[PDB]
């Protein structure tokens, strides 16, 4: 039964609070999974630590990077890279987790979290989540964005983990 995870998030020196995601397997298990292990660090690496390097307000915020911090890196679970399972999930509304990626089939870690409905991504990005609780969280992150997507202040993932 899906997984649900949290993440605990800092801004600048200070706690902002939990976001709590519940992780569709039902839909994607493997990109579920992936997400689900790189909140735990069960396989030895993941989120912890890591930061929202591009944030655009009324579009998303985008994080997962854990390995170069700018968008270039991160590694999933299996891999460097996996591929899409399928688009059945769409881009509805804010608060829903789809993968970043650089083309079909290169999932790794990044990933985003809507902040608006964002259709056009559709057929694009792999959905494959929703926040559950901390919509507030996620909107002082966006809080933070600049249209060309630099923070303006660091957004820390402090915590992470599963509910377990």
């Known amino acids: 039964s899906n997984p649900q995870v949290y993440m605990d998030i800092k801004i600048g020196n200070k706690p902002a609070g939990r976001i709590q995601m519940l992780l569709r397997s039902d839909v994607v298990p493997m990109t579920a999974e992936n997400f689900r292990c790189l909140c735990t660090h069960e396989k030895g690496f993941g989120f912890k630590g890591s930061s929202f390097h591009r944030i655009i307000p009324q579009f998303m915020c985008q994080g997962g990077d854990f390995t170069n911090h700018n968008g270039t890196g991160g590694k999933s679970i299996y891999?460097?890279?996996?591929?899409?399972?399928?688009?059945?999930?769409?881009?509805?509304?804010?608060?829903?987790?789809?993968?970043?990626?650089?083309?079909?089939?290169?999932?790794?870690?990044?990933?985003?979290?809507?902040?608006?409905?964002?259709?056009?991504?559709?057929?694009?990005?792999?959905?494959?989540?929703?926040?559950?609780?901390?919509?507030?969280?996620?909107?002082?992150?966006?809080?933070?964005?600049?249209?060309?997507?630099?923070?303006?202040?660091?957004?820390?993932?402090?915590?992470?983990?599963?509910?377990?």
């Open 79 to 164: 891999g460097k890279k996996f591929d899409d399972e399928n688009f059945i999930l769409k881009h509805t509304g804010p608060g829903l987790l789809s993968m970043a990626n650089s083309g079909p089939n290169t999932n790794g870690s990044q990933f985003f979290l809507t902040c608006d409905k964002t259709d056009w991504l559709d057929g694009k990005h792999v959905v494959f989540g929703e926040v559950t609780e901390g919509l507030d969280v996620l909107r002082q992150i966006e809080a933070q964005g600049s249209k060309d997507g630099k923070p303006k202040q660091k957004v820390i993932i402090a915590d992470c983990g599963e509910y377990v």
